[PDB]
Enzyme design. Structure first.
Site, mmCIF file in Angstrom:
data_model
loop_
_atom_site.group_PDB
_atom_site.id
_atom_site.type_symbol
_atom_site.label_atom_id
_atom_site.label_comp_id
_atom_site.label_asym_id
_atom_site.label_seq_id
_atom_site.Cartn_x
_atom_site.Cartn_y
_atom_site.Cartn_z
ATOM 1 C CB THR A 182 35.351 42.182 -28.796
ATOM 2 O OG1 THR A 182 34.989 43.290 -29.628
ATOM 3 C CG2 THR A 182 34.183 41.210 -28.720
ATOM 4 C CB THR A 183 35.022 40.696 -23.164
ATOM 5 O OG1 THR A 183 36.367 41.169 -23.013
ATOM 6 C CG2 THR A 183 34.790 39.529 -22.222
ATOM 7 C CE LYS A 240 31.450 44.325 -28.635
ATOM 8 N NZ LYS A 240 32.778 44.283 -27.970
ATOM 9 C CB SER A 258 36.852 44.593 -23.550
ATOM 10 O OG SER A 258 37.177 43.630 -24.535
#
Lengths: 245, 229
Positions: B1-2, B33, B170
């Site tokens: 996740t970025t 997100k 990611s």
């Protein structure tokens, strides 16, 4: 067996005196509201009169936002209705958090009527001496379009939809005027301007004073703009001039 | 996740990747997100998907009622405080890193970082997720404060691309949203149009010389790519 009218117990005639007395608290302040729905919008007009010139006119109002898409008008004991508004908002928020969708207007009216009925069966609680008028737009099935909706809740917990309704002092005269106008035209086929003119004419005829724009406040929901918002005074002025013909 | 958020003069730009991964398998490659709180306030979520979703839904419910109660708009600081309180009371049971970024007429554009610990820091830019560790030196070298709106969006997309080029957790789409006094505007750019990836980088085109052909000399002459040669 002597009092039978200070608490929520049945009279020998099978009536609740404390609930009938709360109906007289609605018309006690002397205020009047008229709600109407046209083919694509719903409007509510409430008397907004400020005899005290030292009172900030925009601070006191009878129009409340329950949800962005559901607006409310309270007629009767001014604080009491305020309390109900709070409850309504909570009944919205929890609903929004329970189902993830915005609460329908009919469901909110039904739950508010359920809340009112509780105070008519429990002994220690006093009924709210106001009549609640919720206006909004309803999402229809099988076509997706929006339809205007008016729902009134009584102090007895009676909930009902309306094509047009009036509540408050001299509400019978306003209802008679609206019924007489309904015998000729079809309210559900009129436009917003015609419906607003009819509502203002009924409000004026009930009281017979030819109200100005500062003396009333109008709330509105439309199919193009489902959000509940108050009509600016310029549009109310032009509506009143159109009525004055 | 970025996830990241960068403030410009008008408002803020929120950028995120789209990849929910169960360790080493991609369960979702089109995640979103960037979660709406109010019209002009959003949050970037990293960590446990269920925990962050529940936190965002609860905060959005709290903020929606608050607007009706006060009859005015909500500042970004209020949403930041709501997340900070809710994440601090549950810091031992949830795994969540939150970025709260938005626009309010009073304080302009605001960015707040709420890490796993439960603190709240108001910053010009914030980074989060497993891929954020790759971006810090990217911001120290290539980021200049005071960019325009389009420049900020382009820089955020480039930073996200650089982040998931190196991070295995990611990848996928790049989602950006701009929040300012105007209408908030979203954008989703795919991987095949990403501003950067190592596959299209010319300096990684030549393969490392690992498979030496059997030779009579110590001279390195490239990899053996044929049986005869």
């Amino acid at each position: 067996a002597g009092f039978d009218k200070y608490i929520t117990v049945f009279s020998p005639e099978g009536s609740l005196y404390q609930v009938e007395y709360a109906f007289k608290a609605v018309t006690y302040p002397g205020l009047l509201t008229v709600a109407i729905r046209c083919k694509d919008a719903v409007l509510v007009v409430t008397q907004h009169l400020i005899p005290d010139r030292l009172m900030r006119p925009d601070s006191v109002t009878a129009l409340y936002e329950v949800t962005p898409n559901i607006g409310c008008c309270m007629t009767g004991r001014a604080p009491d209705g305020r309390a109900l508004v709070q409850r309504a908002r909570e009944e919205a928020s929890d609903y929004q958090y329970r189902y993830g969708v915005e609460i329908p207007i009919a469901v909110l009216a039904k739950r508010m009527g359920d809340k009112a009925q509780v105070r008519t069966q429990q002994a220690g609680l006093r009924p709210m001496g106001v009549v609640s008028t919720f206006i909004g737009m309803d999402q229809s099935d099988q076509d997706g379009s929006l339809k205007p909706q008016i729902y009134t809740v009584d102090p007895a917990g009676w909930t009902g939809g309306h094509i047009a309704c009036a509540a408050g002092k001299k509400q019978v005269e306003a209802m008679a005027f609206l019924e007489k106008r309904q015998k000729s035209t079809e309210l559900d086929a009129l436009t917003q301007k015609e419906a607003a003119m009819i509502a203002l004419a009924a409000l004026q005829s009930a009281i017979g004073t030819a109200v100005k724009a500062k003396e009333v406040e109008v709330g509105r929901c439309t199919a193009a703009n489902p959000a509940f918002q108050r009509v600016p005074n310029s549009e109310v002025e032009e509506w009143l001039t159109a009525v004055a013909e | 996740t970025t996830i990241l958020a960068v403030s410009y003069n008008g408002g803020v730009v929120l950028a995120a990747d789209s990849r929910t991964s169960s360790g080493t398998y991609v369960v979702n490659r089109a995640s979103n997100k960037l979660t709406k709180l109010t019209k002009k306030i959003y949050c970037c979520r990293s960590g446990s998907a269920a925990d962050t979703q529940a936190l965002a839904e609860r905060v959005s419910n709290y903020l929606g009622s608050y607007q009706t109660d006060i009859g005015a708009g909500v500042n970004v600081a209020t949403a930041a405080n709501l997340f900070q309180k809710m994440c601090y009371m549950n810091r031992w049971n949830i795994s969540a890193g939150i970025i709260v970024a938005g626009y309010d007429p009073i304080n302009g554009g605001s960015v707040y970082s709420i890490p796993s610990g439960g603190s709240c820091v108001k910053l010009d830019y914030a980074l989060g997720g497993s891929g954020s560790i790759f971006l810090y030196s990217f911001f120290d070298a290539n980021y200049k404060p005071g960019m325009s709106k389009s420049e900020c969006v382009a820089f955020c997309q480039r930073a996200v691309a650089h982040a998931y080029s190196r991070d295995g957790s990611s990848g996928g789409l790049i989602r950006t949203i701009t929040l300012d006094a105007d209408e908030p505007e979203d954008q989703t750019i795919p991987w095949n149009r990403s501003p950067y990836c190592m596959e299209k980088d010319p300096k990684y085109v030549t393969q490392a010389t690992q498979n030496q052909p059997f030779s009579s000399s110590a001279k390195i002459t490239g990899n053996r790519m044929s049986s005869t040669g």
